[PDB]
Amino acid sequence: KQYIISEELISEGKWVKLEKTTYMDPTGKTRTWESVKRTTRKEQTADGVAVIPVLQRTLHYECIVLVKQFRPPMGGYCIEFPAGLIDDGETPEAAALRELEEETGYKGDIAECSPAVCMDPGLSNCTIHIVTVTINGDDAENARPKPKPGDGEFVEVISLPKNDLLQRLDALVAEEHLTVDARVYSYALALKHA
Amino acid sequence: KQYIISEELISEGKWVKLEKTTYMDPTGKTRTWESVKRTTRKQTADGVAVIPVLQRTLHYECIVLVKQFRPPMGGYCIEFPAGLIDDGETPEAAALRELEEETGYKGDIAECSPAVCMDPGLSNCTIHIVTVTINGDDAENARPKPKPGDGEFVEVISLPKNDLLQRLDALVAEEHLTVDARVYSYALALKHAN
Ligand SMILES: Fc1cnc2[nH]ccc2c1
Ligand SMILES: Fc1cnc2[nH]ccc2c1
Ligand SMILES: [Cl-]
Ligand SMILES: [Mg+2]
Ligand SMILES: [Mg+2]
Ligand SMILES: [Mg+2]
Ligand SMILES: [Mg+2]
């Protein structure tokens, strides 16, 4: 029923644009929306990847590997899945494995790759692939893993037991000023609910 | 170690603003970020998202999701029922209200998250994730009357919790829909718990 009529640029930065979207509602009436988009999306099937990194080690419980970073939009530290934009010509799986190694030092193995999923569809067109990666914590390559942060990247690694992830995130929130990412929190909720 | 120095307003619309954020990186170097904010927060968070567990005896538990045209995506998205919290509203109250407006279901609070970020590399947008059970056997949830607001057009989609990820992958495959990242993340953890 509904579809886009026009997209009028309002403001274009180096990294983000604001657009006036005109669309048809299902009563057949024209309406508008203020839509955010990134300037960085070329041919990619999504803007970015988030990595669900499952650290597996003999005689350890499986951990989920998370990163803590200062996020200027938030004015604060945030706990998120390892994540980055897809380079032009890069696959989602390549991007995921590269961002995981850059942000954590860990060398993962692809397990699965989502279709493009929407970050905040009432605000932005922004999409990711959610890529599940296993990390063989028994491999010597993954022994004392060194982050390789790019210019202006500063990442802390936090590995939390999958079997207690939600209470471990609650304990971190209830111990300092920091926001858990909605996707990390949804994943931790589902681990409890299953 | 890192913090906000100042925010420059680049562009304000009715619903969304684009800010140039100046921040101190940990090296002591000043850096700039293009940051999206809503104009609507007063508020624990911008929004609530409801994980509604529809419980009917002798049936599979279902997760209640909504399909909506999302102008920023230029297409239909599958999402947790969700909306912005009114000035003076509690996150819990917004949750039960948005759930009835969007689904017609009347539900009970199980748990409420702290504020979680939607896309902290882009925006300051946060939500409370609110887990709600729906007694599908109660008369008030027999023929649920969804009460949409002005310009809302929401289709209800109940999916079995125990097969959620395969069911969502199927809708994507054969309906060209975008699944929301928090829905997909929840659906992944339901599978990864085992
Ligand atoms: F009616 C509107 C139009 N554009 C928007 N962008 C974010 C919320 C919103 C509501
Ligand atoms: F380096 C930057 C600066 N501002 C940004 N806004 C979104 C991504 C990004 C990267
Ligand atoms: Cl529940
Ligand atoms: Mg990153
Ligand atoms: Mg990165
Ligand atoms: Mg809504
Ligand atoms: Mg609503």
Distance CA A6, CA A98 (A): 37
- CA-closest candidate to residue B6, choices B23, B30, B18: B23
Q: How many structural domains are present in chain A?
A: 1
Distance CA A49, CA A81 (A): 9
For residue A60, give its domain range.
1-194
Q: B147 C-alpha to center of ligand 7: Å?
A: 8
Residues 70-89 of A with CB under 8 A from B: 70-75, 78, 80, 83
B153 touching chain A per CB within 8 A = yes
Contact B64, B134 (CB under 8 A): yes
Structural method:
X-ray
Structure tokens given for B109: 């609070």
The count of other CB atoms within 10 Å of the CB of residue A51 is 30
Query: In chain B, what residues touch A55 (CB-CB under 8 Å)?
Result: none
Q: In a mutational test of the pocket of ligand 1, which residue from A16, A34, A126 has the highest number of ligand atoms less than 8 Å from its CB?
A: A34
The DSSP bridge partners found for residue B121 are: none
Residue A186 three-state SS: helix
A194 touching chain B per CB within 8 A = yes
Look at the block and give the residue holding tokens 């500063």.
A154
Q: A17 C-alpha to center of ligand 2: Å?
A: 11
* b (16+ CB within 10 A) / e for B42-64: ebbbbbbbbbbbbeeeeeebbbb
Q: Do A83 and B10 touch (CB under 8 A)?
A: no
Nominal resolution in Å? 1.8
Q: B97 C-alpha to center of ligand 6: Å?
A: 11
Q: Do A127 and B178 touch (CB under 8 A)?
A: yes
- By CB atoms closer than 10 A (0-12, 13-18, 19+), residue A8 is exposed
The region that residue B28 occupies, defined by phi over 0 for left and psi between -120 and 50 for alpha, beta otherwise, is left
- CA-closest candidate to residue B80, choices B190, B191, B180, B164: B180
Structure tokens given for B52: 């509604």
- In this complex, the residue of A72, A122, A179 whose CB is nearest that of residue B126 is A179
Distance CA B3, CA A151 (A): 17
Distance CA B95, CA B98 (A): 5
**Ligand 2 pocket, residue A36 CB under 6 Å:** no
Q: Do A152 and B25 touch (CB under 8 A)?
A: yes
Q: Please report, for the domain that includes residue A16, its CATH number.
A: 3.90.79.10
- CA-closest candidate to residue B51, choices B81, B21, B78, B74: B81
Contact B95, B50 (CB under 8 A): yes
Side-chain half-sphere exposure of A76, counting CA atoms within 13 A: 20
Ligand 1 atom with least separation from CA of A32: 3
